[PDB]
A and B are shown apart, each in its own frame.
Chain A
Amino acid sequence: SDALALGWPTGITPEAKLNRELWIGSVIASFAVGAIVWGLIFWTSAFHRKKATDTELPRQFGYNMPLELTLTVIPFLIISVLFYFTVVVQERMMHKDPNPEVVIDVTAFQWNWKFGYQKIAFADGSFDYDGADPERKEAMTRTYLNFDKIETLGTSSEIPVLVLPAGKRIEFVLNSADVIHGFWVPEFLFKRDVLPEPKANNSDNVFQVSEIQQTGAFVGRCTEMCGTFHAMMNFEVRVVEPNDFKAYIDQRNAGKTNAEALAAINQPPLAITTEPFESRRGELV
């Protein structure tokens, strides 16, 4: 569990839970194989050592075809079971229901992020908002990029905080203005490359979480080499309650920045799992 997962954080989405369980099982299999083979190595090194009595060279055997085929076929069975579980889990983690409940236009530019809230459609039918802004999108035709009315631009001094509800299906549409970046939230147990033009490059920049189980604050990082400040591009996902989420959206509608709306919704105004980085190139400055 805690020690056997070798450090994976407890999942916060059903896909994360399933991925973590698959990782636990795979680590069990790998460590069992390692224990067996290392026990063989230590049994051969400790015993089977040239003794003082040993006078003549041992049995000069070099071919045991039956055992060769037996240990040829065992790894095939192990990789077969691993492949079955792998394909099951990787198909589960890419389900893509055709009706999302919240849509985010994640845009990565040179060392920051920008979220969109493109289209919110609650499943209970309590809140529908259409944030798609097509005039801005057409104003620069980077047609692949997506714009929105409500945004959260990350800055050198402010970590971009994404606010989402719990128990609500969430879709992320990834776009990068300039180069490849990385969308990783270590709590989702999932990450994706944020490409310049995901469609022209035959990449699937869309992925969904069925529901974020518990609310809170979670750090996200860039996990693809992008240049100078690759380590200084973190962001944050703040999962809140659905009613608090609707209140936050309504405040953001009436011309409110992220910090002001977070303060209005009785939450910390800034990032709390990560902090902005000292612009100073080092401590010897």
Chain B
Amino acid sequence: LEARRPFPERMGPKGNLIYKLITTTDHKLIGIMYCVVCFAFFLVGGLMALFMRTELAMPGLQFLSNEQFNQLFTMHGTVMLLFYATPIVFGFANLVLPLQIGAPDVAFPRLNALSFWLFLFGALIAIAGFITPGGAADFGWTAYSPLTDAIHSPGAGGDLWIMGLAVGGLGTILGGVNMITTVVCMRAPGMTMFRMPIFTWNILVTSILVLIAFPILTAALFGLAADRHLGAHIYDPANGGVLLWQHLFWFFGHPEVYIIALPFFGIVSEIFPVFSRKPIFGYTTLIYATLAIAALSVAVWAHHMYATGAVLLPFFSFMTFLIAVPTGIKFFNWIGTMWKGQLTFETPMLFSVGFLITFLLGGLSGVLLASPPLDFHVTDSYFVIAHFHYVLFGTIVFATYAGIYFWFPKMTGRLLDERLGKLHFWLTFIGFHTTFLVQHWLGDEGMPRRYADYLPTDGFTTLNVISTVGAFILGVSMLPFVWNVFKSWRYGEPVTVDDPWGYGNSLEWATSCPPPRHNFTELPRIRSERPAFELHYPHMVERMRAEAHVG
């Protein structure tokens, strides 16, 4: 027998966190800081989305002007893409990647905190445009060239948008540098490159894509700021200015969407084998598919520029189909992982299945968008809106929640209540499909995107009502998760074991909950890509060797 306490500590004493928040080089605390701040920014973006949907419920302009609605979708898109998704990627990276490779830290612990604070302050700078009397940016998140000049949209909110994006991009580049260096030269003795999990590979390729993409956006933003302040002629339509901005921006922006897609593919590829009681299927195949996606996400940038009539349609359309193939391979590998196993739908596995369904439908919609003749009708319409919301809830919402539910015990030492988790998942699923299934139809029969107001004779009222109802279901779905996290942090069920999910595979389940400072008091003999499984179940090693090949 041994002594304990009846319950663990609810909260630390006074002055236990604030100086850590200011001065920590700990990657786990910094990952938690990303998680919390990214979720707050997600709430702000969703509030903007609810305002837009409430306005779009009825054909009249009830409470929003056109200026305000343009501000709202510009800032909603900007916040959701750049202040929630891109930084939550590095939040998850900081949370688990040093644990996954058996490292005591990231390569540059101070550069990590610098990246986080650059995130926070750039996001704040870009959002502070509402404080201006002219309002925040009201030209969309894509910032197309002539509309963004000193003449058209001349306010200060757009300039704050540009510079906040510059600061956040610098932070993202620094974080990517840190992740690449940490992966390259900080692994444990046994951990070979082909023994890191899928998540580590995905963060590595994501960091490569970040290094490729974000400097382009920074240079484009600096040219735009030159044209706005110094009256430069970089993007002037007399030159090839408008197409110059389109090319530069999309060379950034499609790598951006794959940057926010790949790490969550890694998250689900981590979660699936645990709750499947099986190994991840096609480990090497998944590594190569991830590499193929990373390589191909750089030459397809002009499938967003079909309607301009100034690009090579066959080249980009073919490259888009070619990049569509590997994601199909990835779904096949995930299905093979779930196939013929023992599935228990604790909340992360349920969220991963939701990811599968939602992102599959989004990918089908994207393939439809890939054909230039079909994009000639459905571009700039709510069909694009529905497609990219489907892929974005696939990656950065269902898989974000799956990862949060999965790695909450590892980071806090407490469980999240599974009943509130199931309620939250079903609310999210129903609300999301309610609010985004009908927009395919709404865009097919022409309702363009970014319209603040339409006509009663347009014939769009019923589907917009359904969309607004679903949007408010999505709004009320955040209460179960917020309440669950808030109560479970302090009064959550204690975890006194390693791997409270039973069949964890990677090294983060070989240490305690939470891991101590430097993450490891001992390291196991690493011999495959699931070291914790072999450690915790040593009778299964010969099984796994003998039965690894299906044929």
Contact = CB atoms under 8 A, between A and B. Distances in A.
Interface of A: 5-9, 19, 22-23, 26-27, 30-31, 33-34, 37-38, 40-41, 44-45, 48-51, 54, 57-68, 71-72, 75-76, 79-80, 82-83, 86-87, 89-90, 93, 178-180, 182, 184, 186, 189-193, 195-198, 200-205, 207, 219, 221-232, 273-275, 277-278, 280-284
A229 B144 contact: no
A274 B551 contact: no
A282 B377 contact: no
Given A38-B357, A49-B342, A63-B282, A184 B446 contact: yes
Contact of B450 (A50, A58, A75, A225): A225
A41 B353 contact: yes
Contacts of B457: 273-275
B417 interface: no
11 contacts: A48-B343, A61-B278, A62-B548, A64-B550, A82-B367, A180-B145, A191-B377, A195-B308, A200-B238, A230-B450, A278-B61
Contacts of B548: 60-63
Interface string B416-459: 00000000000000000000000011101110101111110100
Given A63-B550, A191-B380, A195-B242, A26 B368 contact: yes
Contacts of B145: 180
Contacts of A38: 357, 360
Given A44-B335, A223-B379, 7 more contacts: A57-B543, A82-B370, A180-B147, A186-B445, A230-B70, A230-B451, A281-B61
A54 B374 contact: no
A59 B372 contact: no
B215 interface: no
Contacts of A26: 367-368, 371, 374
Contacts of B285: 68
Given A23-B374, A189-B376, A192-B307, A200 B368 contact: no
Given A22-B373, A68-B332, A225-B144, A62 B242 contact: no
Given A37-B331, A274-B455, A8 B367 contact: no
Interface stretch (B21-29, B95-103, B177-185, B309-317): B309-317
Nearest to B140: A225
B547 A178 contact: no
B342 A57 contact: yes
B310 A7 contact: no
Contacts of B8: none
Contact of B372 (A5, A90, A231): A90
Given A58-B342, A66-B551, A282-B65, A196 B242 contact: yes
B428 to A, nearest CB: 17
Contact of A61 (B240, B360, B549): B549
Contacts of A283: 60-62
Nearest to A187: B446
Contacts of B379: 191, 223
Nearest to A40: B335
A201 B497 CA distance: 63
A61 B324 contact: no
Contacts of A191: 307, 376-377, 379-380
A201 B440 contact: no
B153 interface: yes
B339 A62 contact: no
A87 B314 contact: yes
A105 to B, nearest CB: 17
Most buried by B among A31, A67, A76, A224: A224
Contacts of B321: 79-80, 82-83
Contacts of A280: 61
A196 B371 contact: no
Contacts of A64: 281-282, 336, 549-551
Contact of B62 (A22, A186, A231, A284): A284
B189 interface: no
A274 B237 CA distance: 32
B307 to A, nearest CB: 5
B309 A90 contact: no
Interface residues of B, number: 106
A26 B280 CA distance: 32
Contacts of A54: 342
Interface in B271-309: 277-285, 307-309
B190 to A, nearest CB: 19
B5 interface: no
B309 A192 contact: yes
Nearest to A65: B551
Would you list the 7 A-B pairs with minimal beta carbon distance, nearest first? A186-B446, A7-B444, A79-B321, A231-B451, A50-B342, A196-B237, A203-B310
Given A63-B282, A193-B309, A225-B140, A23 B377 contact: yes
A195 B336 contact: no
Contacts of B453: 231-232, 277
B376 to A, nearest CB: 5
A202 B243 contact: yes
Contacts of B322: 79
Contact of A62 (B278, B332, B441): B278
Of the candidates A191, A204, A278, the one having the most CB atoms from chain B within 10 angstroms of its own CB is A191
Given A37-B335, A200-B237, A228-B66, A57 B340 contact: no
Contacts of B372: 86, 90
Contacts of A186: 377, 445-446
Interface in B471-504: 503
Nearest to A58: B341
Contacts of A180: 144-147, 242
Query: Which of B67, B146, B237, B357 has most A Cβ within 10 Å?
Result: B237
B381 interface: yes
Contacts of B462: none
B206 to A, nearest CB: 23
Most chain A CB within 10 A, of B142, B282, B446, is at B446
Contacts of B339: 44, 48
Contact of A275 (B279, B381, B455): B455
A62 B548 CA distance: 5
A261 B328 CA distance: 58
B120 interface: no
Nearest to A282: B61
Given A48-B340, A50-B344, A64-B551, A71 B329 contact: yes
Contacts of B314: 83, 87
Contacts of B226: none
Contact of A89 (B152, B308, B373, B441): B373
A102 B452 CA distance: 35
A71 B356 CA distance: 17
A139 to B, nearest CB: 19
B64 interface: yes
A29 B463 CA distance: 25
A40 B356 CA distance: 11
Interface in B121-172: 138-140, 142, 144-147, 152-153
